[PDB]
Symmetry: C4
Subunit: 114 residues, 4 copies
């Protein structure tokens, strides 16, 4: 019968742990990506308004007057922030893919017929 | 005893896979249908306003002035979009119902007493 | 040993089914109750406004002008609706409690020592 | 073999029950903390507005005019409320940590080699 050594069974278990970890990182990345897409869409729309357009912003359950330039600035900052977060998550994702690649190769090498 | 052949056991398994797949498609269809109903209700209400009615729209956390005609147009587009999506999902649903019908018939034919 | 007859085992199973069904009805009732409480709070607040107070209402992502009297009326209707729904759910709940009471009594009578 | 007495097995079970209970209390505390942080941020922002700034508030799906001072007051009250709630939850949390500490010590003492 095929005899998977205890150390390889351990690698198989860790491979599954990494897969679950990657699934989470990807879900975190996608949430950030969705928010980033929405923010960019909002900025695009606000930027198309005439400079003297009336603009209000929400502060919790409150609504106060703001201006086109201020809303644009606050949206740029939100986008800046989300992109920094997105990059960090993509770096974590890339690291996980590499660990999965390397561990998969080690398992295949260990189980390869002599 | 009743002896369900391995191939029929496979059909029974696929039948369950299709059922789970249909459940999902139906949930996707219902989410689209709910959004479509809400959009139609909103359009109905906006269309009942006097042509010179004051209208504001939300852009993310911001609020800007718009007009009755522009809001109506944007709502028509949303509805147009949702209906295209709804039809595609209904086509997927119909396909799944037919596969379930045909596979159920094959299982019954295979297990029918000689 | 204690020998629970097959029919009593069936009653025990149905008792659990009713319990799960009641749990759901209660959750439905509580969601309706929460919405009703929020609507009443909103009506209370709007009714305290001066008759000439400026009021806007949301229609999806849009905001249009309304009046104090119109908002009050629409809130009364929402409350009317929720109360009708709440009563129906409470009637279902009462029915379930009675079935649980009666089935529990039947099980205890069936298992009572001779 | 190691023989965990029935009473210690009971303590181990209760330890796990307390852990699950603490997990919940912590989740409740964190929800309150998030709301408190958001409210403080909103108050900070509203307080930075000029005294004559125009302010509207939402009442359900409605929007009515308010004032800077009134919004500030209502936010202070919300924060006051959340802090009272936060403290109560932190008191429950501290109690749970102490029970976990004491029960862990009892288990270790009971299982300690003679």
């Amino acid at each position: 019968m095929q005899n998977i050594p205890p150390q390889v069974q351990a690698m198989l278990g860790q491979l599954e742990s990494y897969q679950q970890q990657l699934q989470l990182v990807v879900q975190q990345k996608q949430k950030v990506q969705l928010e980033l897409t929405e923010a960019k869409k909002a900025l695009d729309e606000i930027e198309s308004l005439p400079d003297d357009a009336v603009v209000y912003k929400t502060v919790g359950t409150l609504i106060v007057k703001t201006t086109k330039d201020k809303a644009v600035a606050e949206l740029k900052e939100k986008i800046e922030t989300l992109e920094v977060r997105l990059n960090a998550l993509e770096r974590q994702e890339k690291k996980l893919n590499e660990k999965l690649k390397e561990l998969t190769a080690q398992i295949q090498s260990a189980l390869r017929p002599p």
